[PDB]
Amino acid sequence: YDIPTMTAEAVSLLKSLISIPSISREETQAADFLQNYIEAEGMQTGRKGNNVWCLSPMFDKPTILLNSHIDTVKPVKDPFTPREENGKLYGLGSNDAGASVVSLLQVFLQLCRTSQNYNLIYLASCEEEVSGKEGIESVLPGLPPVSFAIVGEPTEMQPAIAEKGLMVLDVTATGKAGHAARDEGDNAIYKVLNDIAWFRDYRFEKESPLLGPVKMSVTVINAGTQHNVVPDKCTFVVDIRSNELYSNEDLFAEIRKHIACDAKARSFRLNSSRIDEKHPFVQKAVKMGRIPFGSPTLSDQALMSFASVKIGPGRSSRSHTAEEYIMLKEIEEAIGIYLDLLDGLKL
């Protein structure tokens, strides 16, 4: 396989992508450029919103989905004009997750000219950064059944075989009005003090070797208006991160048995992910010296019910950061590693 030519082409397509603003929900022009780029490779695409896909020829055999996102986080030097400096390509969305988008497509295109035991689907999803309803969630029900998926996010090409989920809970304590200088009222602030300590100290029974215990964090609180008015109402927000041993639904039910104050989940759908260690892909990865781990960062894996693994070029620490960059050498390395894992893989 011609790695240097795939790398040189992946890098030019990424410069184009960095130059096109593609913040969550305002990704139309980037999606245009992507679709029109693939079309020029003799491939017939599919589209829904700013989500673009491409099925392999002669399908339906197990199917492997190759996926990453084209939306970016808002900025914050340089704007989004690409710049190269002694091996580094600077740009918003270069590390998270552009580098993965350009590598997987080059790999998809090369593998479409080889004889494999599986069908292959490429997907450039949108609204990943805000967990948006018109992202990946809107496309899965139309595509053919997915047997296995690779999600491209920066993991220094290490296989993330477990990923924490996300659930946000709004809790409200209702007290009673009064004069603070008198013997009147029910203080809504006092009512939530034990609740907050419980959120910080409670440990769910099942603990994961890869993600440790379920994590819960009280990160926003509000109550009261002026100093001589009894606070009637108090609201707080809990950010909850399941391990792969629990659903968001299992956690909410447990929590409602210990907390008396009204509590509501904003959603239950962004669950944790898991893939069995004997899975053929995990097994070939390990035989190639890769070290499987568990990721604390949410991705498009959370909207996938089928088995998946998170593995892509770049590093976590550069994401959502000033002067974000990807190394030309990391893209070269990613393409070659992706090719070795997939070529001759039997599910």
Interacting residue ranges for Cl ion, rule: CB under 5 A: 131, 177, 179, 181, 228, 265, 276, 279, 307
State yes or no: residue 215 binds a copy of itself (CB under 8 A).
Answer: yes
State yes or no: residue 200 binds a copy of itself (CB under 8 A).
Answer: yes
State yes or no: residue 117 binds a copy of itself (CB under 8 A).
Answer: no
Taking the least distance from each CB to Cl ion, the nearer of 127 and 195 is 127
By CB atoms closer than 10 A (0-12, 13-18, 19+), residue 281 is: buried
* Least distance CB 304 / a copy of itself (angstroms): 19
Q: Is 314 left (phi over 0), alpha (psi -120 to 50) or beta?
A: left
Pairing of strands 83-85, 88-90: antiparallel
CA separation for the pair 67, 126 (Å, rounded): 11
Q: Which residue has the tokens 């995990």?
A: 282
- Residue 177 touches which of Cl ion, a copy of itself, none (CB < 5 to 8 A by kind)? Cl ion
Among 21, 62, 224, 292, binds a copy of itself (CB under 8 A): 224
Phi, psi values for residue 139, rounded to 5°: -100, -40
Among 69, 164, 191, 310, binds a copy of itself (CB under 8 A): 164
Pairing of strands 308-310, 233-241: unpaired
Among 149-157, 219-227, 270-278, 333-341, the segment contacting a copy of itself (CB under 8 A): 219-227
The distance from CA 267 to its chain's CA centroid, rounded to whole angstroms, is 16
State yes or no: residue 220 binds a copy of itself (CB under 8 A).
Answer: yes
Taking the least distance from each CB to a copy of itself, the nearer of 47 and 320 is 320
Taking the least distance from each CB to a copy of itself, the nearer of 324 and 332 is 324
Phi, psi values for residue 177, rounded to 5°: -65, 155
Taking the least distance from each CB to Cl ion, the nearer of 19 and 235 is 235
**Which amino acid makes up residue 115?**
S
Question: How many residues form the binding site for a copy of itself (CB under 8 A)?
Answer: 39
CA separation for the pair 47, 31 (Å, rounded): 9
Pick from 23, 38, 66: nearest CA to 311: 66
* Bridge partners, residue 164, by sequence: none
> What does the block give as tokens for 94?
């270069």
- Residue 307 touches which of Cl ion, a copy of itself, none (CB < 5 to 8 A by kind)? Cl ion
* Least distance CB 318 / a copy of itself (angstroms): 14
- Residue 274 touches which of a copy of itself, Cl ion, none (CB < 5 to 8 A by kind)? none
Cβ atoms of residues 59 and 46 within 8 Å: no
State yes or no: residue 193 binds a copy of itself (CB under 8 A).
Answer: yes
Cβ atoms of residues 30 and 69 within 8 Å: no
From residue 65 to residue 94, the character string flagging contacts with a copy of itself as x (rule: CB under 8 A) and all else as - is ------------------------------
Residues that bind a copy of itself in the complex, under the rule CB under 8 A: 164, 166, 168, 179-182, 187, 189-190, 193, 196-197, 200, 215, 217-231, 234, 236-239, 241, 296-298
